[PDB]
Design a protein around this ligand. Structure first.
Ligand SMILES: CC(=O)N1CCN(c2ccc(Cl)cc2)CC1
Length: 185
């Protein structure tokens, strides 16, 4: 792909984070803590899952960023509506305002309803995410495999401002403590 020139500098929004997340001082890295991180509750925080939003809101244009997923067993990545549900149980789908892919139990899947199997020969250490607001497109790229396409959501109905979306996943196994990191431009 040739989307690199639409690179944007994403930072994480502490106020949206699940209360067990630890965000670095530079707001570029997030990981699961072993306990509640001693923050007050608020209506923005994701309650049920280890999720956080980027601070940036997008309503036009073309945007590209990259996320490091090295040595994680489970994670979700993509974009979502600013108005997504924060509290309680929900599935990641375009109907609920999410355009995402994930790793879970040694398989990669796109967050359609129902979910779609992905075909990845080279497990990615870094993921590129491309959003074309006007075209209604969200695409995912395998940076470890020379930028090969993972998945394209097309005919997207964004229906609002978009935010970068992250889920570091639970760490029941003791093998998923590693962070998500926003990679430098
Ligand atoms: C609990 C803690 O402080 N940890 C564990 C997770 N860590 C980590 C960083 C990068 C990568 Cl690739 C893998 C794992 C940092 C140190």
């Amino acid at each position: 792909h040739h989307h690199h020139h639409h690179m944007v500098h994403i930072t994480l929004d502490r106020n949206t984070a699940n209360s067990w997340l630890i965000i670095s001082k530079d707001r570029r890295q997030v990981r699961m803590g072993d306990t509640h991180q001693n923050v007050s509750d608020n209506k923005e925080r994701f309650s049920n899952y280890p999720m956080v939003l980027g601070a940036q809101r997008f309503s036009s244009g073309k945007m590209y960023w990259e996320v490091d997923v090295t040595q994680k067993e489970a994670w979700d990545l993509g974009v979502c509506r600013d108005s997504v549900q924060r509290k309680g149980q929900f599935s990641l789908s375009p109907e609920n305002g999410f355009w995402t892919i994930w790793l879970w139990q040694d398989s990669y899947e796109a967050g359609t309803s129902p979910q779609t199997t992905l075909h990845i020969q080279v497990p990615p250490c870094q993921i590129g995410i491309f959003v074309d607001y006007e075209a209604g497109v969200v695409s995912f790229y395998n940076i470890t495999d020379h930028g090969s396409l993972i998945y394209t959501f097309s005919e997207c109905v964004f229906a609002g401002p978009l935010r970068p979306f992250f889920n570091v996943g639970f760490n029941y196994s003791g093998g998923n403590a590693a962070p998500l990191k926003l990679c430098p431009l």
